[PDB]
């Protein structure tokens, strides 16, 4: 009936899209030199690690999205406050 | 307030215009096809 199919209906592909968008959220369009830059890899590393914590702590698909959605908004606010000076 | 940070936060989401917008819209089509 229901044993441990939780992670069976969730694919790596689905998550891959989530991580990619997670990066996009912070850096929408990096230039060719930025993409091959260490800072970008570190940025992806953040997305990769955060992806790990989410999957481990989520326990549920709804929570999986919920955790990320709140997390993205938190960054978004931080970026916006930062932009206030850097006009 | 810092103790019940999670609870207090949870309440705000319930009245977060952009959060609700992005929450509904984005989850409306989670990409995923091999």
């Amino acid at each position: 009936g229901v044993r441990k199919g939780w992670h069976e209906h969730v694919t790596q592909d689905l998550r891959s899209h989530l991580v990619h968008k997670l990066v996009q959220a912070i850096f929408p369009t990096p230039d060719p030199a930025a993409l091959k830059d260490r800072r970008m890899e570190n940025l992806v590393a953040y997305a990769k690690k955060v992806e790990g914590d989410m999957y481990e702590s989520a326990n549920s698909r709804d929570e999986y999205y919920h955790l990320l959605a709140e997390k993205i908004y938190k960054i978004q606010k931080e970026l916006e406050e930062k932009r206030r000076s850097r006009l | 307030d810092s103790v019940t940070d999670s609870q207090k936060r949870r309440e705000i989401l319930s009245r977060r215009p952009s959060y609700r917008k992005i929450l509904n819209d984005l989850s409306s089509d989670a990409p995923g096809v091999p």
């Binding site: 912070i26 850096f27 929408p28 369009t29 990096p30 930025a34 800072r39 570190n42 940025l43 953040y46 914590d53 702590s57 709140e70 997390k71 938190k74 960054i75 931080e78 970026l79 930062k82 932009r83 850097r86 | 940070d5 999670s6 936060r9």
Partner: peptide, 19 residues
């Protein structure tokens, strides 16, 4: 909450970029 905010350095660079 498991740290939903980034360290300053990550934010510092991204803001320094503006397409």
């Amino acid at each position: 909450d498991a740290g939903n905010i980034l360290p300053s350095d990550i934010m510092d660079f991204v803001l320094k970029n503006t397409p």
